[PDB]
């Protein structure tokens, strides 16, 4: 049914293909939805992520402010390409959200739409390979006030091998600084710059969570309820092997 990219019992994914793979960034700064304010600072996240993913070997494509049908179209075409010579696929989305919802320029769609077309049955050439998703967007409007601490052939599931990283926990707000970008993307890019080549993905995202959890705290003196709030990312993994990028 599909080509075997690595032997059955390997502890690591085979990241020694000709290409690292495609990295698609859907960056959303402005919206044709009256209730949505501009996301000043997202271009800093976009530039920063694009730069680090290039050093890691990704062929990066940034899609600025697409309508929902546009995102869906490019996603399908990507799922339709031949990924035989790529180690993996990375999709990133920087935008506004609600629980179970992401916003395009014109309207909203379900986050599941991003990875739906990449299951092994729909995209055989990435079968057995890691499919990465990073989402910077709110998953609701709840706030985390934080707390102070003192003193020959083998078969696999078509849903295996997905890593889905949300900037925040379901139901919660996600924070963005207008001059430095989002907390999640600042921490993600910094950890990728420091150990992106040598550390496994889960360990790396564990430290990305630490950074977001410890080094950030909201400052909004004009709105007490939004002030001094905290945040922790939510990493969802279906990875069946360890992921270490290595150097191409």
């Amino acid at each position: 049914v599909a080509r075997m990219p690595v032997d059955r019992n390997a502890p690591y994914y085979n990241m020694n293909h000709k290409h690292r793979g495609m990295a698609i960034i859907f960056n959303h700064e402005h919206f044709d939805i009256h209730s949505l304010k501009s996301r000043t600072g997202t271009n800093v996240d976009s530039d920063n992520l694009s730069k680090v993913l290039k050093t890691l070997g990704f062929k990066v494509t940034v899609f600025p402010n697409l309508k929902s049908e546009e995102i869906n179209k490019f996603i399908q075409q990507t799922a339709e390409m031949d990924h035989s010579d790529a180690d993996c696929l990375l999709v990133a989305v920087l935008t506004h959200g609600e629980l179970g919802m992401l916003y395009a320029k014109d309207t909203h769609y379900k986050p599941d739409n991003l990875w739906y077309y990449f299951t092994a049955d729909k995209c055989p050439t990435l079968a057995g390979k890691p499919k990465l998703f990073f989402i910077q967007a709110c998953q609701g409007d709840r706030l985390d006030g934080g707390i102070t601490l003192s003193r020959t052939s083998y078969r696999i599931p078509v849903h295996a091998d997905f890593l889905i990283a949300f900037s925040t926990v379901p139901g919660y707000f996600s924070w963005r600084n207008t001059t430095r970008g989002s907390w999640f993307m600042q921490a993600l890019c910094e950890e990728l710059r420091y150990a992106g080549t040598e550390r496994d993905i889960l360990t790396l995202l564990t430290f990305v969570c630490q950074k977001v959890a410890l080094d950030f705290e909201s400052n909004a003196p004009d709105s007490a309820m939004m002030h001094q709030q905290k945040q922790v990312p939510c990493i969802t993994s279906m990875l069946t092997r360890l992921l270490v990028f290595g150097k191409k």
Partner: peptide, 4 residues
């Protein structure tokens, strides 16, 4: 600081 703002929310998404």
């Amino acid at each position: 600081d703002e929310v998404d």
